[PDB]
């Protein structure tokens, strides 16, 4: 472990056989600055201020990812095809701000200890599935080389609606449901 | 029954201490969750981390062009991007929203950077005994959160004060809660 | 004008 005032990743480069798929992102003190949409070839910055003064070209990410694809296939042979081990993720659900009934708020679903980085995070309202007003972060890196992902559900809290965060992972036998209510 | 996956990670990390004065880079080459090779700027050469690493570490250490480019990354990536951090991340100052809900929870919401100090007061006095605070909560959208609970047995005249300090403030945020009935 | 972000390059494993 290294003691520093600030820790940054320029960047987190991920490529997995399943898919196959990959990820490119820059992190600063555990927060995601941007991610590159490798299909669209676009940099998606997380804060508005950042675009004004910073610019990352997507090709650099795509090029790094090709190198990772090359390295992966060589290291799989050297390891005698040792596969990834499935970890049990930890789910925590909390609101963004204090709950005021009938007023804009966001429900936060933290999924920690994710490995490997393949996960389904969905929201339920009174048991039924919600699709609109749902956003999520990329797979945020951890020092132990596992990941955490945070899902968001914008809503106006009410006395008649109860929510759940359904998480599907290979390290789970059944989908994990974490309940939240105002 | 579970799908097979082979995972590769590359982490290009920068460690910054005392403004610009101290900068350290560590690049990490990871197979699944195993770091097998790394370049540390304080070391200056590639080092294997597990028996999976010597073929990669020795080969990159035999390429003087690879060594030069990686050593220079402390300037071309770390010191460079830190100048961009001073204009962005290290500029961001989000003031906390402090509220009291009734035993008495002081919720300090949506602030940036992480540094926070919350203090509970009953009337004139400060309260050390009955105070239970949650750890710092990362929301993931460049804001933090913290909730400080206070075990209180409220009397008739009592005024409860949550006192909050943060780098974004010149003076502390004082929020009060008067005793009911 | 925004300045170009620096990025680390992964070292390439020996193909042969």
């Amino acid at each position, epitope marked *: 472990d290294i003691v520093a005032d600030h820790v940054a990743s320029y960047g987190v480069n991920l490529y997995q056989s399943y898919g196959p798929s990959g990820q490119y992102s820059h992190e600063f003190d555990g927060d995601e600055e941007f991610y590159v949409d490798l299909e669209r070839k676009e940099t998606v910055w997380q804060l508005p201020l950042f675009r004004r003064f910073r*610019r*990352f*070209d997507p*090709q*650099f990410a*795509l*090029t*790094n990812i*090709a*190198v990772l*694809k*090359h390295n992966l296939n060589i290291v799989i042979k050297r390891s005698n095809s040792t596969a990834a081990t499935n970890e049990v993720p930890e789910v925590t659900v909390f609101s963004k701000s204090p709950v005021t009934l009938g007023q804009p708020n966001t429900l936060i679903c933290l999924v920690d200890n994710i490995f490997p980085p393949v996960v389904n995070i969905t929201w339920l309202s009174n048991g039924h599935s919600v699709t609109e007003g749902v956003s999520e972060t990329s797979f945020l890196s951890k020092s132990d080389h596992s990941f955490f992902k945070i899902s968001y559900l914008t809503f106006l809290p009410s006395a008649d609606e109860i929510y759940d965060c359904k998480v599907e992972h290979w390290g789970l036998d059944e989908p994990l449901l974490k309940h939240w209510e105002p | 029954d579970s799908p097979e996956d082979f995972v590769y990670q590359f982490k290009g990390m920068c460690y910054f201490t005392n403004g610009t004065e101290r900068v350290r880079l560590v690049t990490r080459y990871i197979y699944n969750r195993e770091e097998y090779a790394r370049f540390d700027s304080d070391v200056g050469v590639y080092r294997a981390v597990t028996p999976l690493g010597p073929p990669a570490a020795e080969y990159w250490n035999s*390429q003087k*062009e690879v060594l*030069e*480019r990686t050593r*220079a990354e402390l*300037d*071309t990536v770390c010191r*460079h991007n830190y100048q961009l951090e001073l204009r962005t991340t290290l500029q961001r100052r989000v003031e906390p929203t402090v509220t009291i809900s009734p035993l008495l929870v002081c919720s300090v919401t949506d602030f940036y950077p992480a540094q926070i100090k919350v203090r509970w007061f009953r009337n004139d006095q400060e309260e050390t005994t009955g105070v239970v605070s949650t750890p710092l909560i990362r929301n993931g959208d460049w804001t933090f959160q913290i909730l400080v609970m206070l075990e209180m047995t409220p009397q008739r005249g009592d005024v409860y004060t949550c006192h909050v300090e943060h780098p974004s403030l010149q003076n502390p945020i004082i929020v009060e809660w008067r005793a009911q009935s | 004008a925004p*300045s*170009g*972000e*620096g*990025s680390f*390059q*992964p*070292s*390439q494993e020996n*193909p*042969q």
Partner: T-cell receptor
Amino acid sequence: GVTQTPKHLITATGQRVTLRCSPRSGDLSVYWYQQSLDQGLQFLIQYYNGEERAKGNILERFSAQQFPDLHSELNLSSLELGDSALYFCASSVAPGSDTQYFGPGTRLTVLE
Amino acid sequence: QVTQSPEALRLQEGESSSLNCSYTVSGLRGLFWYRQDPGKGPEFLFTLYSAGEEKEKERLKATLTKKESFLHITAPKPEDSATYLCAVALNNNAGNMLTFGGGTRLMVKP
């Protein structure tokens, strides 16, 4: 290390030509550059491990390929007099900031 | 943007000189020097990543600052006559391509 065929090419307008390149032994990334008297040395395209990477202000008339043996082919169709230039192939070990090593080049002359 | 000066240089045998290569951007990945015989492929000379960096081989010495790079040529011979090309790799660029300067046509009069 980098070889390029043919060394010279003389052809009529409207024709299509193929320029080949063999990178340095062990080099996985290839880059094409055009050297004209008007624009000087300009980047066309890059290939790594058989796929397109960086791309210049190249025209739809221009297309390249990188074969599994890592040799590249630069295809220039519907040729104009302005396409008369030197076409250099460069190769590097990896596709990042690695040193780019140029081939002898192909001199193309497009005549009416 | 990468600029080279002078466009042409006429030196006498043994007459030491310097070649300038300015780059207006900030965000370097690498600065490269090549020597090109007319019609032949550019021949690689030096790579500099960082300000205060310097490299030397034979009669050539390359240096780097935040604004530019100098190519110092001490006591040149007629064999040193060529087009000296400066190229940059940049963060602002759409990948790892090189952006070349206009070059310096060096002519060493014996």
